[PDB]
């Protein structure tokens with residue numbers, strides 16, 4: 001098959017096209033409600049560009065995730081009839097696919113937030129579309145407050161807020177009782193199937209269900225909800241092996257992973273219809289709940305888990321953890337099987353577990369995460385009265401205080417809670433405050449050439465290639481890069497030996513390093529170097545004096561200091577928690593007295609990820625505010 005125009009005119013939103021453009025015309029702020037797949041993200045931009053709003057400025061539309069922003073900009077450029085990056089483009093952290101021609105721009109919420117820092121009145125935009133607002137992320141909640149302020153100054157601007165939920169009433173009341181525009185649409189019955197007893201391994205259960213659906217259920221594609229990439233990559237390998245084990249007579253199952261770090265060629269495959277006699281299985285994360293819309297899906301497999309940030313209010317530390325979904329999310333997952341016809345949802349949990357063991361809705365991200373980055377962004381925009389900031393769902397006053405005192409000990413805020421030269425310099429980088437700090441400190445410590453590489457290597461995933469077939473051999477290849485001082489300097493050694501071997505792809509194959517990842521680090525480095533140069537921050541090498549690198553790391557990650565326990569593992573300096581060096585660490589067979597880790601990862605044990613050896617003396621030297629027992 002059907003032409004792009006026929007596909008576009010088949011969408012539920014098409015029936016309300018003229019009435020939608022008139023509503024935008026008549027109202028400064030409009031709340032748009034419609035079920036997922038009605039065409040809000042992809043058509044609202046196009047309708048208003050056609051109405052002529054692009055003559056006044058850009059039409060910007062936020063997306064919560066990378067794959068969402070890239071996919072919708074690719075589709076909309078095919079529908080618009082242009083090059084991707086020309087009239088229609090996207091902006092993600094470290095990838096700006098826009099140009100002087102761009103009139104429709106899809107960007108992550110974090111990217112629009114970074115634009116507010118530079119231009120608080122968003123004068124470049126005629127229309128701001130806060131999309132997928134029901135997902136309620138820190139960046140979305142921050143953008144509501146910022147745009148509430150913008151709408152007052154910019155009388156010419158148009159603000160469209162979308163929702164796939166009746167949480168539109170809260171958004172309407174928030175935005176001066178703004179009108180609500182409803183896109184009616186057909187929702188079909190979904191047969192919800194629960195397990196009689198819980199499952200030991202939800203991964204196994206998902207695979208068994210997928211094969212049972214594929215072999216015994218009428219045609220329709222399958223959507224599987226998993227928690228991350230490692231888990232998705234594994235599920236795909238086993239499913240492929242298991243399907244191969246059935247023999248050549250068996251009908252084809254097209255196994256399609258979906259996650260943030262996916263090559264764009266892999267991203268387009270998930271939207272192609274299956275050939276006749278074949279079936280698709282899309283193995284995705286919670287991106288597939290609302291952000292991505294795949295046609296032909298009639299079956300959903302739901303293990304009931306999601307990876308989400310949990311916060312400790314006492315210690316001020318947040319962490320990504322695998323927890324059950326809210327009841328609202330279970331309904332969203334099930335609904336994906338009832339978009340184009342009746343479907344089935346296989347819940348890999350009991351009816352009792354749904355009814356009792358599940359929260360109605362989850363707590364907004366702003367009330368279950370560390371606010372240091374948020375507070376730093378707000379202080380950089382001149383927003384010092386944090387109590388005066390109009391949040392839709394206010395974080396606890398204790399959290400805003402915790403966030404303030406952390407930036408203080410970092411040296412971003414002074415005694416009067418105002419930004420310092422450090423804080424200002426830190427705010428110029430799209431990185432988390434502990435990463436900014438160590439980059440700005442490396443300028444003073446004379447190792448910014450090294451820190452630019454380390455910050456970049458830490459901003460990429462999957463640096464080392466470790467196939468399931470060649471695991472022992474991979475580990476032998478990785479050990480050749482192992483530095484006595486730790487993981488951060490091992491990451492610098494990988495990049496420098498790649499650079500010295502003239503950025504060779506065959507060198508990467510030989511050494512089991514992932515060339516795509518080093519090429520991404522090189523790109524991030526080029527961009528970070530650009531900021532240093534604009535702000536005249538000196539780029540100096542430490543030569544062989546790598547202790548300077550260690551001091552710089554410590555100056556930013558002192559909160560993550562740990563001491564070796566004489567019996568088992570390490571005890572964190574902050575809450576005296578038992579933490580462990582992971583078997584993949586350069587320090588695994590040389591565990592020092594004191595370390596600093598990049599992040600904590602919860603698997604079987606609480607593991608420290610990216611560990612560097614420190615002198616405990618540096619804690620007093622680089623974080624003196626962070627101490628008690630200071631007088632007689």
Ligand SMILES: Nc1ncnc2c1ncn2[C@@H]1O[C@H](COP(=O)(O)OP(=O)(O)O)[C@@H](O)[C@H]1O
Pocket residue numbers: 011034035036037038039040041042043071072074075271290292293294295
């Ligand atoms: N790359 C893509 N990204 C997003 N949607 C796509 C893509 N390719 C095709 N589509 C189609 O676009 C249609 C319209 O969806 P969309 O505008 O995202 O709706 P809504 O925002 O209301 O959920 C969907 O039916 C989907 O299959």
Ligand SMILES: [Mg+2]
Pocket residue numbers: 040041042131132290291
């Ligand atoms: Mg959408």
